[PDB]
C-alpha cells in the first residue's frame, strides 16, 4: 500500500 507520487521525471538508469 503506497500513497500518491506521480511520475514526472524519467526513471534512473535510462
Amino acid at each position: 500500500s503506497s500513497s500518491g507520487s506521480p511520475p514526472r521525471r524519467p526513471p534512473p538508469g535510462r
Partner: antibody, heavy 115, light 113 residues
Framework: VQLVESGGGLVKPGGSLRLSCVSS????????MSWVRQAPGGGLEWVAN????????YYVDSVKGRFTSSRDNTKNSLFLQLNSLRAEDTGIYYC?????????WGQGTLVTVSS | DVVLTQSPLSLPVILGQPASISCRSS???????????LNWFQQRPGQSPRRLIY???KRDSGVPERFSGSGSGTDFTLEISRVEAEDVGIYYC?????????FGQGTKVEIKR
C-alpha cells in the same frame, strides 16, 4: 485557468524558434509544466517537462539536444527553444499543465518548418 | 515506449446510442505507487484537446456526466452513455506510468444522421 502560447511561425529547416506560454488563474510556482505537440494529420507526442523552478528539464528522445526549456516564475511564463528544426518538427505546440495529468491545455501555436 | 492501441478508430454512432472506446496497453500500466496513470482527452473540431478522464475513471469537473471510464492493467474503456451531436471529435487515451508519456492514435466519433 488559462494558458496562452505564442512564437510559432514559419522557420526554415535548421533555423531556430522560441515559443512562450503565459499562464493565468493559478499559482504558477507550484506546478510542473509540459509541452505536447501534434503533427500534421497526426496525433499527439509529448515533448518536454519542466520543474517548478526550472531546475529539471526533460525532453522526448527525438528532440534531445535540439530543444531547450526555460521558465520565468516572476512573469508566470514558460519557454521552449527549438533549434536545428527538422521537417518532422512541424505541428501544433501545446502548453499543458501538470504532467502526467495534463489537466489544462493552451490553444496551441503552429510551427511550420519550410524553406 | 508503451504503445496504446485504440479500437475502433472510426466510430459512426446513431444519435443517442451508447458508445465505447477501447484502449489496449502494451505493458501493465500500474505505477510503483499503485496508481494507474491513464487519461482520456477530447479534441473537438478546431480546438485543442481537453482532458475528460484521469486515472482510468476519475472524471473532470467540466465534463458531462455521460462520460465515464473503466478498466485495469492493459485494457481500459471510455464509455459514453448517450452520444450527443456535440460529441463529434477525436478521443485519445494517454498513459503516464511509463517513460515517456504516450498517446493512442485517436478515435474519430461521427454522428450517423
Amino acid at each position: 485557468v488559462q494558458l496562452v502560447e505564442s512564437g510559432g511561425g514559419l522557420v526554415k529547416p535548421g533555423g531556430s524558434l522560441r515559443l512562450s506560454c503565459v499562464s493565468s488563474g493559478f499559482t504558477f510556482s507550484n506546478y510542473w509544466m509540459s509541452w505536447v505537440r501534434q503533427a500534421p494529420g497526426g496525433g499527439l507526442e509529448w515533448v518536454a517537462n519542466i520543474n517548478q523552478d526550472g531546475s529539471e528539464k526533460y525532453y522526448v528522445d527525438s528532440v534531445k539536444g535540439r530543444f531547450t526549456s526555460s521558465r520565468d516564475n516572476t512573469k508566470n511564463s514558460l519557454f521552449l527553444q527549438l533549434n536545428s528544426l527538422r521537417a518532422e518538427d512541424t505541428g501544433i505546440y501545446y502548453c499543458t499543465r501538470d504532467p502526467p495529468y495534463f489537466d489544462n491545455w493552451g490553444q496551441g501555436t503552429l510551427v511550420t518548418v519550410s524553406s | 515506449d508503451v504503445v496504446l492501441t485504440q479500437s475502433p478508430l472510426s466510430l459512426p454512432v446513431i444519435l443517442g446510442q451508447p458508445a465505447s472506446i477501447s484502449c489496449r496497453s502494451s505493458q501493465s500500466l500500474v505505477y510503483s505507487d499503485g496508481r494507474t496513470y491513464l487519461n482520456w482527452f477530447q479534441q473537438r473540431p478546431g480546438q485543442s484537446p481537453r482532458r475528460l478522464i484521469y486515472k482510468i475513471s476519475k472524471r473532470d469537473s467540466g465534463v458531462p456526466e455521460r462520460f465515464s471510464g473503466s478498466g485495469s492493467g492493459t485494457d481500459f474503456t471510455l464509455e459514453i452513455s448517450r452520444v450527443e451531436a456535440e460529441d463529434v471529435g477525436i478521443y485519445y487515451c494517454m498513459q503516464g506510468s511509463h517513460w515517456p508519456v504516450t498517446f493512442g492514435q485517436g478515435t474519430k466519433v461521427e454522428i450517423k444522421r
